[PDB]
Amino acid sequence: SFATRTSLAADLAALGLAWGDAIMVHAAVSRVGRLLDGPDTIIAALRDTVGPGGTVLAYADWEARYEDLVDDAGRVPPEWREHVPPFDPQRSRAIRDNGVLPEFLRTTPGTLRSGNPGASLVALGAKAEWFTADHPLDYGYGEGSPLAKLVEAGGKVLMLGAPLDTLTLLHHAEHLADIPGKRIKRIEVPFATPTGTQWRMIEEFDTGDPIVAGLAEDYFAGIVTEFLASGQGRQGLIGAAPSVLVDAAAITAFGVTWLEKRFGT
Interface residues with a copy of itself (CB under 8 A) are 2, 4-6, 34-38, 40-41, 63, 65-66, 69, 83-85, 90-91, 93, 96, 104, 107-109
Query: If we measure between CA atoms, which residue out of 225, 245, 229 comes closest to residue 14?
Result: 245
- The answer to the question of whether 171 is labelled as a binding residue is no
69 binds, among ligand SIS, a copy of itself, none (CB under 5 to 8 A by kind): a copy of itself
Site size toward ligand SIS (CB under 6 A) is 8
Q: Which of 84, 78, 80, 79 lies closest to 64, judged by CA? A: 84
Asked if residue 246 belongs to a known ligand binding site, the reply is no
Residues for the chain: how many in total?
265
Would you say 30 is a known binding-site residue?
yes
CB-nearer residue toward a copy of itself: 2 or 19: 2
**Smallest distance from a copy of itself to CB 86, Å:** 10
67 binds ligand SIS (CB under 6 A): yes
**C-beta of 108 vs 197, nearer to a copy of itself:** 108
Q: Does 55 bind ligand SIS (CB under 6 A)?
A: no
Q: Where are the beta strands (DSSP E) in the chain?
A: 22-27, 55-59, 112-113, 121-125, 156-160, 184-193, 196-205, 234-238, 241-247
Interface stretch with ligand SIS, choices 1-9, 37-45, 61-69, 74-82 (CB under 6 A): 61-69
Yes or no: say if 91 and 27 are a contact pair by the CB < 8 Å rule: no
Please tell me whether 27 is known to bind a ligand. yes
3-state secondary structure 117-182: CCCCEEEEECCHHHHHCCCCCCCCCCCCCHHHHHHHCCCEEEEEECCHHHCCHHHHHHHHCCCCCC
Among candidates 157, 162, 185, which has minimal Cα distance to 254? Answer: 157
**Residue 151 in marked binding region:** no
Taken in order 141, 259, 253, 10, is the CA torsion positive or negative? Answer: positive
Cβ 134 to a copy of itself shortest distance, Å: 24
CB of 118 to ligand SIS, least distance (A): 3
Pairing between strand 121-125 and 112-113? Answer: antiparallel
Burial of 216 (0-12, 13-18, 19+ CB in 10 A): exposed
The reply on whether position 114 binds ligand SIS by CB under 6 A is no
The interface partner of residue 208, options being a copy of itself, ligand SIS, none and the CB cut-off 5 to 8 Å by kind, is: ligand SIS
Closest contact distance (angstroms) between CB of 145 and a copy of itself is 26
26 is in an annotated binding site: yes
Inter-residue contact 12 to 47 (CB < 8 Å): no
Site string for ligand SIS, 179-218 (x = CB under 6 A): ----------------------------xx----------
Annotated binding site for CoA: 26-27, 29-30, 96, 100
Residues that bind ligand SIS (CB under 6 A): 61, 64, 67, 118, 165-166, 207-208
